[PDB]
Each structure stands twice: as structure tokens, then as C-alpha cells.
Amino acid sequence: AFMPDARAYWVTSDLIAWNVGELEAQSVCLYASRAAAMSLSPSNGGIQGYDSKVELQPESAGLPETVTQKFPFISSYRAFRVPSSVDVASLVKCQLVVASFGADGKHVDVTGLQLPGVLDDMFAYTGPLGAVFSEDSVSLHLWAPTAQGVSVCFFDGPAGPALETVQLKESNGVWSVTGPREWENRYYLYEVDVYHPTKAQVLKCLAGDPYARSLSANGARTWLVDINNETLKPASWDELADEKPKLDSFSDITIYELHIRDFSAHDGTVDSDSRGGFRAFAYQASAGMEHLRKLSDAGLTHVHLLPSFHFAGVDDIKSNWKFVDECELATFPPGSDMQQAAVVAIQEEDPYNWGYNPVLWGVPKGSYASDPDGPSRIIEYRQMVQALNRIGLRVVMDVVYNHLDSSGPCGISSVLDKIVPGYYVRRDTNGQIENSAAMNNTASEHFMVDRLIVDDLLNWAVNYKVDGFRFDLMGHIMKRTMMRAKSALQSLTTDAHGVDGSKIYLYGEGWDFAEVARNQRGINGSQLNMSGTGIGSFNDRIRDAINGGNPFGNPLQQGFNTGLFLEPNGFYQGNEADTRRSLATYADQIQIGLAGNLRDYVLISHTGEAKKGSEIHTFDGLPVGYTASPIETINYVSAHDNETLFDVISVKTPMILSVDERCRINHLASSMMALSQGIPFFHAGDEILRSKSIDRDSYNSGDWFNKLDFTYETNNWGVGLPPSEKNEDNWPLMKPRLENPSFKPAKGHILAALDSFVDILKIRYSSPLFRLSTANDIKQRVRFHNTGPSLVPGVIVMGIEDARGESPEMAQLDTNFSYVVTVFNVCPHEVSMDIPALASMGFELHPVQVNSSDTLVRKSAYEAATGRFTVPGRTVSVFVEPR
Ligand SMILES: [Ca+2]
Numbered sequence: 001a002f003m004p005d006a007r008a009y010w011v012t013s014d015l016i017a018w019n020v021g022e023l024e025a026q027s028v029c030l031y032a033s034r035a036a037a038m039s040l041s042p043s044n045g046g047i048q049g050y051d052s053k054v055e056l057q058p059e060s061a062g063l064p065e066t067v068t069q070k071f072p073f074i075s076s077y078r079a080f081r082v083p084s085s086v087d088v089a090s091l092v093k094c095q096l097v098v099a100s101f102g103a104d105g106k107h108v109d110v111t112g113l114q115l116p117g118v119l120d121d122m123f124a125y126t127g128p129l130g131a132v133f134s135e136d137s138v139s140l141h142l143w144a145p146t147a148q149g150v151s152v153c154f155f156d157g158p159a160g161p162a163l164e165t166v167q168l169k170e171s172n173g174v175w176s177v178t179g180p181r182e183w184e185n186r187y188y189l190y191e192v193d194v195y196h197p198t199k200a201q202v203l204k205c206l207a208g209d210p211y212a213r214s215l216s217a218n219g220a221r222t223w224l225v226d227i228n229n230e231t232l233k234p235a236s237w238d239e240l241a242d243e244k245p246k247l248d249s250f251s252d253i254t255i256y257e258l259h260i261r262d263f264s265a266h267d268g269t270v271d272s273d274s275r276g277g278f279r280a281f282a283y284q285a286s287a288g289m290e291h292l293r294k295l296s297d298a299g300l301t302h303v304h305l306l307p308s309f310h311f312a313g314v315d316d317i318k319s320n321w322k323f324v325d326e327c328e329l330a331t332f333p334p335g336s337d338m339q340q341a342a343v344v345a346i347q348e349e350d351p352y353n354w355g356y357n358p359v360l361w362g363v364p365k366g367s368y369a370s371d372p373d374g375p376s377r378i379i380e381y382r383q384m385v386q387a388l389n390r391i392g393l394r395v396v397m398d399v400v401y402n403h404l405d406s407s408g409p410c411g412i413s414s415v416l417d418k419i420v421p422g423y424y425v426r427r428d429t430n431g432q433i434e435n436s437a438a439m440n441n442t443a444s445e446h447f448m449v450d451r452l453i454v455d456d457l458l459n460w461a462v463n464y465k466v467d468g469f470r471f472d473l474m475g476h477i478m479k480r481t482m483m484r485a486k487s488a489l490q491s492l493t494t495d496a497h498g499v500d501g502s503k504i505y506l507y508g509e510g511w512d513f514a515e516v517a518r519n520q521r522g523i524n525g526s527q528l529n530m531s532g533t534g535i536g537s538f539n540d541r542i543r544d545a546i547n548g549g550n551p552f553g554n555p556l557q558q559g560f561n562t563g564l565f566l567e568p569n570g571f572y573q574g575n576e577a578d579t580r581r582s583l584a585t586y587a588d589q590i591q592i593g594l595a596g597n598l599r600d601y602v603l604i605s606h607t608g609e610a611k612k613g614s615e616i617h618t619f620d621g622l623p624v625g626y627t628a629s630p631i632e633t634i635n636y637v638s639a640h641d642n643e644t645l646f647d648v649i650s651v652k653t654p655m656i657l658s659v660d661e662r663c664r665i666n667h668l669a670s671s672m673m674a675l676s677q678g679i680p681f682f683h684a685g686d687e688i689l690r691s692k693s694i695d696r697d698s699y700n701s702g703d704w705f706n707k708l709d710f711t712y713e714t715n716n717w718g719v720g721l722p723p724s725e726k727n728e729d730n731w732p733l734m735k736p737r738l739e740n741p742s743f744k745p746a747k748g749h750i751l752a753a754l755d756s757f758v759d760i761l762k763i764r765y766s767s768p769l770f771r772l773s774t775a776n777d778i779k780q781r782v783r784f785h786n787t788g789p790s791l792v793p794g795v796i797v798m799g800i801e802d803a804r805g806e807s808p809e810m811a812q813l814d815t816n817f818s819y820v821v822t823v824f825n826v827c828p829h830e831v832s833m834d835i836p837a838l839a840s841m842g843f844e845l846h847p848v849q850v851n852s853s854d855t856l857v858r859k860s861a862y863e864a865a866t867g868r869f870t871v872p873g874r875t876v877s878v879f880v881e882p883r
């Protein structure tokens with residue numbers, strides 16, 4: 001059910017805002033009902049069922065600055081004063097309406113009130129929430145300022161009946177009770193008597209604790225556990241800070257994005273109880289962990305795990321899970337629609353979901369634990385973090401503070417909106433819930449939401465020693481929330497909290513759209529607003545320029561690395577002159593991205609004109625470069641959302657290409673990330689040609705379409721048409737590709753891709769020149785050599801200078817090399833790039849490539865006489881000048 005009409009706002013203890021006309025409103029009245037008994041029958045004409053009524057006086061000047069700064073979208077609203085003899089604290093517990101009356105008489109308008117403003121003004125609370133343990137006692141605190149009553153129900157274990165109810169007492173919107181230490185390890189729920197607008201009734205609801213630290217299966221009950229308890233800690237837990245991989249600089253970060261279930265779902269070297277969960281990471285002897293160890297040893301610093309907190313959509317009870325038969329599905333044709341039909345038939349009841357469906361942020365996901373009741377979810381999550389740290393990998397959590405799975409009074413999956421209806425969720429100007437994020441958008445602009453987000457971040461940092469956070473839809477989060485979180489986390493110390501907060505890294509998707517766009521709800525965490533914060537955002541410009549098109553465009557639109565102009569695929573994209581100009585535009589966008597996507601980096605563009613990164617624009621008119629630092633740029637070409645790297649290349653390149661050619665194209669795309677300034681971001685599987693059978697949104701597509709094969713025998717290409725819900729419109733382009741045997745790589749291709757990926761990682765970490773930490777360093781040191789109207793199409797040449805000669809004008813960063821030149825050649829044929837500025841130097845092919853298993857790259861050459869660099873087709877060559 002929709003929330004009722006609520007077009008007025010209660011913004012402070014004394015002020016109500018409502019966009020009503022001057023002559024349209026002679027006077028305005030507020031009506032309250034304790035029992036939610038108000039109605040408006042057209043036969044009677046007047047509001048009935050009210051316990052009280054109070055006239056509001058119009059406030060000529062309007063709303064104070066503190067309101068309009070907080071809620072800018074109502075800055076134009078007329079202001080109405082509530083007399084100070086009105087018991088506001090009692091009234092917010094009631095059903096409320098406001099009514100307008102013409103200066104001639106008779107009701108002209110009636111509406112409900114949106115209460116967050118007044119709830120913050122009067123009841124913002126900074127004290128303890130959830131459970132607090134002392135030597136002799138346990139206390140519980142719940143923020144529920146609109147509730148008429150709150151009790152706690154204690155349970156006989158995770159499945160047993162209620163044993164005891166205890167009433168809580170209210171003070172300033174906060175309900176609390178203190179009990180004996182013996183309450184420890186009980187299970188509980190709050191019983192909350194509250195007016196729910198969606199049902200127009202005061203209902204008695206059972207809710208979990210927003211500040212839960214553990215749960216029974218599916219969050220049915222909250223476990224009253226002391227998170228600091230010694231028995232919940234793996235061996236050596238309190239010494240993990242001493243074991244954490246060194247991180248000299250944020251500019252040294254590389255990120256690998258991985259789904260916890262994908263990691264081990266198909267790993268036969270992992271035991272059956274650990275497969276698909278946290279424990280499979282503590283299995284150091286597996287093919288999966290050996291794979292991560294290999295990447296980590298080559299230089300990978302961070303693993304970004306998909307949502308791992310309490311989300312909806314997967315049953316925590318493993319015995320409820322439904323599976324397909326993989327042996328059967330393997331016999332269906334590669335372009336058949338039967339595999340997806342089988343998956344879709346059980347997708348609501350299978351073990352699989354990305355997890356972008358938040359219920360409680362503070363608790364590990366039960367389905368990823370060996371037992372969803374008791375201590376295992378806590379212990380095993382910690383075991384995972386420890387195990388990753390031990391193989392040289394820091395751990396990033398994908399956090400999803402932008403929306404909730406559910407709202408309203410009904411269901412196991414609604415918590416926040418059950419307790420304080422209408423507060424935690426963002427609403428439009430008619431009172432309906434905003435759904436632009438997916439459904440049930442949160443409102444970080446509200447005090448207690450901001451508090452819950454920051455408190456949750458601190459929970460993961462301190463209680464689980466998490467090393468970083470990726471913020472889903474950061475643009476839906478207020479900038480002030482992001483900045484306070486940054487201040488709070490970065491001030492944690494090993495002595496006082498057990499973790500070095502100064503090393504915690506934050507980044508997010510700064511997409512600016514819908515109701516939050518252009519600062520409508522306040523300064524939000526969009527890409528542009530986050531410039532100069534030290535918080536990273538995904539660089540979509542470099543992604544689209546390399547791959548071609550856009551997630552919202554025609555799938556056949558080519559880019560720099562998918563054959564635009566050079567290798568036309570037959571989908572019409574203009575004449576030769578149009579496609580060549582589009583190629584050169586993408587080349588400029590990529591070069592800005594390679595230099596850290598800085599707003600003030602100056603590039604010679606394809607017109608021959610010198611332009612700042614922010615002066616170069618996208619097709620839709622946005623500045624390409626926007627950051628103040630390379631650490632604010634997350635460069636990527638692939639991720640869990642949209643088609644994998646292998647699949648996008650297979651769609652966009654000409655059908656006539658061999659998989660051998662497409663293998664090198666995959667490598668070029670990952671090398672562009674791996675050798676860029678800023679922070680490279682890799683989708684798990686980039687390195688082994690991972691396919692999802694061209695699934696563009698595999699969130700609910702099961703283990704079948706999301707397979708990671710650490711035997712390296714297959715890449716999951718050609719396993720049927722992907723689920724129709726998200727893919728059907730593109731099936732006609734997918735079928736002939738999936739059925740064509742020359743599109744499928746063999747084991748030798750997959751292993752070659754892996755070997756080359758590891759090599760390019762090693763090159764990144766072979767020289768500090770690839771990882772400059774400031775905009776000044778990049779502006780002084782990084783040059784592009786193939787520019788202007790006469791640029792060679794399909795070639796990028798990037799030079800990086802270090803101190804050389806007697807008394808140089810820069811610090812010496814590299815003890816081994818004095819200059820580095822990278823040539824990205826996406827042309828099918830060999831190129832010869834003459835760079836006279838680099839003649840008479842001691843360039844050699846990088847030792848890693850000299851000793852490469854790839855025969856082609858070993859053919860690369862430099863000629864000192866002319867500064868000529870020769871690079872084979874579809875190759876990235878790195879040349880170094882040894883000291
Ligand atoms: Ca490592």
C-alpha cells in the first residue's frame with residue numbers, strides 16, 4: 001500500500017510548512033487522534049474522530065535558514081506557527097492532519113504531515129543505542145519517538161516460544177530498560193505500538209533491533225550478544241593490526257571485485273560446508289585461495305566483496321535452498337533458452353543474490369555462515385578478514401546505505417520503517433516513498449539515518465577490522481554524511497580501537513540522478529561534489545570510452561578498444577570521418593582518465609588545442625576530468641553490473657575475429673586500468689576471460705550464469721541465453737555468438753590471459769612512477785606523445801618522467817628507472833611511433849615483458865637514433881630506461 005497524502009511538513013517544534021495559496025487559506029488547523037480514528041466523509045464535510053484541534057498562525061517571514069538548508073526543496077513553502085502551549089511530544093505519537101479553510105469559509109484542502117524535521121528538532125539522540133553491557137547489567141535503547149508503547153520480548157533460543165515480556169520506559173523519544181547480566185545471549189524482539197500511515201492504524205509490531213550485532217536465521221530475532229566477547233574471536237584476532245599488509249599510500253591501491261558465493265560455489269577443492277560462504281576464504285589449500293594468492297603476490301592490494309551484511313532474497317536456512325542440475329543444463333544447446341527457464345523457475349528460492357537488498361546493516365549474512373543461529377556468522381566473518389589479510393589482501397565492504405529492501409508494518413524483511421514509519425525512508429512532496437535507488441530510498445539528510453550509517457561503518461571497522469568501504473549509489477547519500485564518516489573512521493587508532501583508521505579507504509558510485517540530482521535534497525555525494533574530498537568515485541568516462549557506448553545505448557556501439565573506425569562491426573555508426581572523430585574523442589577521454597582523471601591536467605586534444613581535463617566533455621556535455629587527486633579516481637572497464645569484459649568484447653568486436661584476437665583485446669583493456677594513474681578496479685574474472693553468457697544484470701541469475709571456474713577449463717561462455725527479464729531484447733544478437741564455436745576460449749587462452757594479467761600487475765608495482773600520489777606529480781611527470789589532428793588512430797603513448805641528470809628539477813622516486821613509456825596499440829597491425837623527444841635514451845623493453853610467455857610482445861623495439869618505438873598489433877608495450 002502507498003503512504004497517504006502528506007503534503008505538509010512538521011519541520012521544527014514550532015513550525016509547520018505547507019505550500020498553500022494566500023487567499024486560498026484564511027486559516028489553517030491541526031487535528032490529532034490518539035486512536036487513529038479520523039475520517040473525512042463528503043456527506044458530513046468536516047473532519048471527524050479527533051481528540052484535539054489547534055489553530056496555527058501564519059508566519060509572514062517564513063522558514064528559518066536551518067530548515068531550508070536541511071530541506072531546500074520546501075524553501076518556497078508558507079510557514080505556520082504552532083503555539084508553544086501545545087504538547088508536541090504527545091502529538092507526534094498521534095494520527096495528524098492539517099486543514100486549510102478559505103477566507104470565505106469551508107475546507108479547501110486537507111493533508112497528512114511529514115514529521116522528520118520535528119522528530120530531529122525535538123528528539124535527535126546521540127546516546128547509546130542497541131545493547132550496552134556492563135559488569136552487572138545489560139541495557140537496551142531504542143529510538144522510537146512516535147511510538148505509543150515499546151516492550152521487549154525474550155525468547156527460548158532462536159526457534160523457541162516467547163518466555164518473558166518487559167516494558168520499556170520512554171525519555172525524549174528513547175525507550176530503554178536495564179536488566180541483569182544473565183540477559184546475555186538471549187534472543188529478543190521489540191514490540192512496538194505505533195501509528196502506521198500505510199494502514200491508517202496504531203499497530204503492535206514485532207521488530208529486530210536496528211543496532212543488532214547478531215541475528216537468528218533470516219533475522220527473525222535479534223541475538224543479545226556481547227560483540228567484544230572473547231569466544232567470538234579467532235586465534236590471534238587482537239593482533240591482526242600487526243599482521244595487516246602494509247599500505248604506504250592510497251595511490252598504491254588496486255581493487256578486485258568479488259562475490260562471496262561466486263568465489264567458491266564451484267570450487268571442488270573446498271569442503272561442502274564451507275562452499276559459497278565466509279569459511280571458504282579460511283581454506284588456504286583451495287584453487288580459489290591459490291588464485292587470490294597469485295594476484296596478491298603480483299601486487300593486488302584490496303578485495304572488494306559484494307554485500308555481506310543482512311540482506312533479503314536468500315534464505316539463511318540452507319535446507320530450504322533449491323538448485324538446478326548442472327550436469328543436465330550442460331547438455332542443452334549453447335544458444336537455447338532452456339537453461340534460463342530452469343534458473344528462473346527457482347531463482348526466488350535458490351542460494352543466490354548479489355545482496356543489494358538491505359534489512360540490517362550491522363550483522364553478517366546468515367546464508368554465508370555454516371550455521372545461521374549462534375556465534376558462527378560473527379566468528380566466520382572475522383576468520384575471512386584475517387585469512388585475506390594473511391595472504392596480503394585488505395578487505396573492502398560493499399555498503400548499501402541508499403535504500404531498504406522493505407518498508408511498512410508487515411514482514412520479516414522490514415525493520416527500520418516498522419519502528420519509525422516515514423522517517424528512515426525518503427519521501428516525495430506528496431508523501432509517497434522515493435524508489436529511484438531501487439525501492440525504499442533512505443534519507444541520510446535525517447539525523448538518525450546519518451547516525452546509523454556512521455555507527456554501522458564504525459562497527460565494521462572496529463568489530464571486524466574491515467579495511468575499506470565501497471558506497472553503492474553514493475550520490476543518494478548526503479555529502480556531510482560521507483565527510484563525517486571519513487573523519488570518524490580515519491581517526492581510529494590501533495592503541496585505542498585495535499585498527500589503524502588512517503589506512504581505511506572510501507570510494508563510491510557518485511551517480512547523480514532522480515530526486516537527489518543537482519543538490520535538490522542537499523549537497524549529495526555526486527562525482528562533482530566529491531571532487532576534493534579524498535573519496536574515490538568510479539570513472540564512467542574511461543569505461544564508456546574504452547568499451548564504446550553506454551549501459552543505456554545500443555549494445556553494438558564500438559569504442560577505442562572494441563574496433564571503432566579501425567575494425568567496423570557492421571552496425572552503422574556514421575561514415576569513416578564520423579567514426580574516426582569519435583575514436584579521437586574517446587582517445588582524449590581515455591588519456592584524461594590515464595592521468596588520474598584530474599580537472600586541471602592539461603592535454604593536447606585531437607583538435608591540436610590544449611585543454612584541461614574539465615574542459616574536455618562527454619557526448620552528453622559533462623566534464624571528463626573532475627578530480628583534485630588521482631586517489632579520487634577509480635578507473636574501470638568492468639564490474640558486477642553490466643556485461644563482463646569478455647562478453648562486451650564478444651558483442652562489440654567484429655564477428656569475424658578469432659577468440660585469440662579477442663583474448664589480446666581483453667588484455668589491452670585490463671592493462672589500460674593496471675597502468676593508469678588513479679586506482680585500478682578489476683572485476684573478478686577479467687583475468688581469466690569470465691563470461692556470464694552475455695547476462696547484463698546477473699543479480700538473480702544463480703550460480704549457473706555467475707560461475708567462476710578455478711580449474712580454468714571453461715570461462716562460462718555459451719551456457720544458454722541469459723534470463724529474459726533483463727536480456728530478452730538482446731537475445732537475437734546473443735544466440736549466433738553463443739552458438740559459434742570460434743567464440744569460445746580453450747584452457748590455453750584462459751591461462752594465457754591470466755599469465756599476461758599477472759605480468760601487467762607486476763609492472764605496475766615495479767615502479768612508483770605508475771602510482772603518483774598527487775595532481776602536481778602527474779602534471780610535472782606524465783606526458784602523452786600521440787596527440788593532435790594527425791594522431792595515429794588506435795594508439796596511446798604515455799610517458800612518465802623521473803629525476804635525471806645533474807641537479808634535476810624533481811625528486812627521484814625510482815631507484816631502478818629514470819623514465820617509463822607505455823604504448824597501448826589497439827590497431828590490428830604493428831605500429832612505429834617516432835618520438836624525437838625520447839631519442840638518444842637507454843630504453844629497453846620492461847624485464848617482465850622481455851621474459852614474457854607472450855611471443856608477440858617480445859618483438860617490441862626501441863631505436864635510439866630516431867626515438868622510434870615499434871609495437872606489434874593488439875599489444876601493450878612498456879619500455880624503461882634503466883639507471
Ligand atoms: Ca597483495
Ligand SMILES: [Ca+2]
Binds near residue numbers: 347351
Ligand atoms: Ca536468487
